[PDB]
Every structure is written in structure tokens, then in C-alpha cells.
């Protein structure tokens, strides 16, 4: 079932690994991809999850600037 | 003179450093301005003789 199940972390790690989108807990994102498994085309999974990172749920991407807060 | 076959005789004009100087040491005629000062630029395409030895 790699078509759908090995194709969740290829999508999920990418967000939780990048230091720009790493402002999240692993379980929080483990959830938001099983939810959005059957939501956007099977060649556009991570691609349109970036819509939920910019059009929706954004500014939390890049984060609140802690390296300006402690500053 | 007036021909263009005089390629093996430019040791009296240019120097080893790479700066072309006019014929003033010997003291000859300098009326040939286009056939010498201007005709030398046509041979800079193939540039068979090195113009700048320091480069």
C-alpha cells in the first residue's frame, strides 16, 4: 500500500524537517496528513498541503520570531 | 612600405614589454600613417605576433 501509506511521510517529514516549517510537534503533523490523505490529487499531496501552510494556517510557518522575542 | 607581406620585421617598432612606440630613434619618414599605424589593427584578428608579451 506504498501508493498511499509510504506516501504520507515523504510528505510529512518534509514539513517537520525544514527549519522554516519545523515550528510543530511530530504528532500534530502525523494527524493532519491522515486527515488530508484523500483531499488533494495523488501527485499533489505535499504540493497542496503547502496551501494549508500559506492560504490557511500561515504566519505560524516561519513562526513567531523567537530569535526576535529573546532579542 | 606599401605592401602587407612585411610581417617578419616589426622588431623595430614594438618592444618586448608590449608598448608600441613610433619610429623616433633612427629618424626616418613618418608620412605613412594609415599604412602603418592604422593598417596594423587589421592584423590583430589572427594576432600571430604577440602584442603583449607580459600577458
Amino acid at each position: 500500500m506504498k501508493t498511499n501509506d509510504n506516501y504520507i511521510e515523504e510528505v510529512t517529514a518534509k514539513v517537520l524537517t525544514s527549519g522554516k516549517y519545523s515550528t510543530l510537534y511530530p504528532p500534530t503533523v502525523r494527524r493532519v496528513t491522515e486527515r488530508l490523505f484523500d483531499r488533494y490529487p495523488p501527485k499533489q499531496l505535499e504540493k497542496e498541503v503547502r496551501k494549508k501552510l500559506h492560504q490557511a494556517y500561515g504566519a505560524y510557518i516561519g513562526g513567531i520570531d523567537g530569535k526576535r522575542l529573546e532579542k | 612600405e606599401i605592401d602587407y607581406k612585411d610581417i617578419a620585421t616589426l622588431k623595430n617598432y614594438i618592444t618586448e614589454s608590449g608598448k608600441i612606440v613610433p619610429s623616433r630613434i633612427t629618424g626616418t619618414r613618418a608620412k605613412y600613417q594609415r599604412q602603418l599605424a592604422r593598417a596594423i589593427k587589421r592584423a590583430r584578428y589572427l594576432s600571430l605576433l604577440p602584442y603583449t608579451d607580459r600577458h
Binding site: - | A8, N12, E16
Partner: protein, 100 residues
């Protein structure tokens, strides 16, 4: 069969090898149906770039119509030699009584 002109230099501190270097190189270009059109020696004059540790340099000028089957190994001979610094090969030049 074209026209060639090999202009190289020797070692500045080895001036006695000049008459012995051209002698051992004019025999291979003679029996291959080639002759020497011009043969003049300039001398150890002054330069304008002190690049070598020792700035003396004798220039060798000679014209010979060597075939292509011999210039492939003659040019690589000066690379292994330590006295020869550099060289200069032109193209399509005829002979002249003198150049300066």
C-alpha cells in the same frame, strides 16, 4: 608537406650546450626529405619579464619544412628536457635573408 618554424630557447646558465643541441636535432629532419631554409642566431639579449630565476635567454631561429609524421615526437622532446624553457611554433611562413 607544409611550412613550420620551431623557435625555442635554451638554459641561461648553460651556454655551451647551444652548439650541441641543434646538432643532434638537425639529423632527424634531414633524412626525412627536409632541408633548412634559414638559420640565424640572435643571442643572449635582455628581456622585459624576470619570470625565470635567471633572466638570461638565447633564442634559436631556424626554418625547416618538417613533415607531420615527425613533429608529433619532436615537440614532446623539449617537454622532458630541463634546459629548454618554452618554445614557439608558427604556421605558413616563407624564408627571408634576415628579419632585423
Amino acid at each position: 608537406m607544409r611550412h613550420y618554424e620551431i623557435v625555442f630557447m635554451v638554459h641561461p646558465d648553460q651556454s655551451e650546450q647551444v652548439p650541441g643541441m641543434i646538432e643532434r636535432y638537425t639529423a632527424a629532419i634531414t633524412g626525412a626529405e627536409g632541408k633548412i631554409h634559414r638559420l640565424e642566431d640572435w643571442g643572449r639579449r635582455q628581456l622585459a619579464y624576470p619570470i625565470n630565476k635567471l633572466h638570461k635567454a638565447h633564442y634559436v631561429l631556424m626554418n625547416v619544412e618538417a613533415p607531420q609524421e615527425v613533429i608529433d615526437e619532436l615537440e614532446t622532446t623539449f617537454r622532458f628536457n630541463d634546459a629548454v624553457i618554452r618554445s614557439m611554433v608558427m604556421r605558413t611562413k616563407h624564408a627571408v635573408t634576415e628579419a632585423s
